[PDB]
Design a protein around this ligand. Structure first.
Ligand code: NA
Lengths: 121, 126
DNA sequence: GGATGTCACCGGATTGTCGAAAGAGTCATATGACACATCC
DNA sequence: GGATGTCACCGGATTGTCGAAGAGTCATATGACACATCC
C-alpha cells in the first residue's frame, strides 16, 4: 500500500520526538537538497494486551497520511523537520513506498544529529 | 441402464434351462397375449470369496422379450449357447419395442413367477 | 491383459444399504461455511 | 461499529517466514495415485 520509505524511530521513553532547527531528515542518497523536508508521524500499537513503544515514521512533505498539511501545521502525532535549503513544495516525484516492491531504508541520520532520550540512531 | 424386467431363474443343478413348447414366459400383468414371447439368456459371474480363492456362482437365466435385450438382433429360434427360446400359444413373432427393457434406476425387477403347472428342470424352482 | 470401479460379501451385484446433488479405496490438499479477533 | 484477517510474538507487523500465497476451525469435496474387479 503506502509506507514511509524510512523504517521508524522507536520511542522507548515517554518524551516525544524533537529535533533542533535543521536536524532530523533521514539520509537518502536518491534525494536532492530541495527535497530535504517532511514530517514524522506517530503510530502506536497494542498487543494479554499491552501497548507498545510508539513508532515515528518519516514522510516527505506532501506525501503520506498528512500529504494535505503544509509544513508547520500543528497536529498531535505530527512533528516537522527540514534541512536548511529545502523547498516548501509537495514531493510528488518521491511519494511513498510500496512494501511489495521495495524494502524500507534503515533510517540513519548524519553523525552528530541530536536525539531525545528515548531514541537511538 | 438396460436390464431384464424380471428376476433371474437360478440354476442350482447341472442341466441348462429348458421349457416345453408354450411354457416358460414369466407372468407380467402389463403384457398382452401377443407379447408373450422371448428368450432366457445365461449369465455367470465368479467372485473372490473370503477364502481368497476365485469361485463360480450358480448361473442366472434372465428373461428378455423378443427383440429386446442383449440378443435383440436374434429372431425366434436362433441357435446360440446360453440362449433358449420360449413363447405362449398365440404370441406374435414381432419385436416388442413397446415393452423394451428395464432401467434399474427407475424400476425394480418383477419377481419371476410362472403359471402354476409350468414344468421346470430340477435345478430350477418357481 | 486392458479398461473401470474402489460399499456389501452374493441373498438381489441385472441389488440392497446408508444416506442422498449419490455413490462407495487411500491420502493429501482445496473449498466453503462459520466463528471470533483485529484494524480502522 | 463495520469491514477484514485468522501465522510470528514485536526485532522489522509500514516485516519476516515457510513454502508458494497467505496464515482461525471443521466438515466435506477433489484429484492424483494405487490395487481390485469386470469384460
Ligand atoms: Na428393434
Amino acid at each position: 500500500n503506502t509506507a514511509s520509505w524510512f523504517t521508524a524511530l522507536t520511542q522507548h521513553g515517554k518524551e516525544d520526538l524533537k529535533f533542533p532547527r535543521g536536524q532530523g531528515v533521514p539520509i537518502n542518497t536518491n534525494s536532492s537538497p530541495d527535497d530535504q523536508i517532511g514530517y514524522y508521524r506517530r503510530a502506536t500499537r497494542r498487543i494479554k494486551m499491552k501497548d507498545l513503544s510508539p513508532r515515528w515514521y518519516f514522510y516527505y512533505l506532501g506525501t503520506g497520511p498528512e500529504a494535505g498539511l503544509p509544513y508547520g501545521a500543528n497536529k498531535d502525532g505530527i512533528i516537522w523537520v527540514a534541512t536548511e535549503g529545502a523547498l516548501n513544495t509537495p514531493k510528488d516525484h518521491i511519494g511513498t513506498r510500496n512494501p511489495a516492491n521495495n524494502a524500507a531504508i534503515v533510517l540513519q541520520l548524519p553523525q552528530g544529529t541530536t536525539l531525545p532520550k528515548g531514541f537511538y540512531a
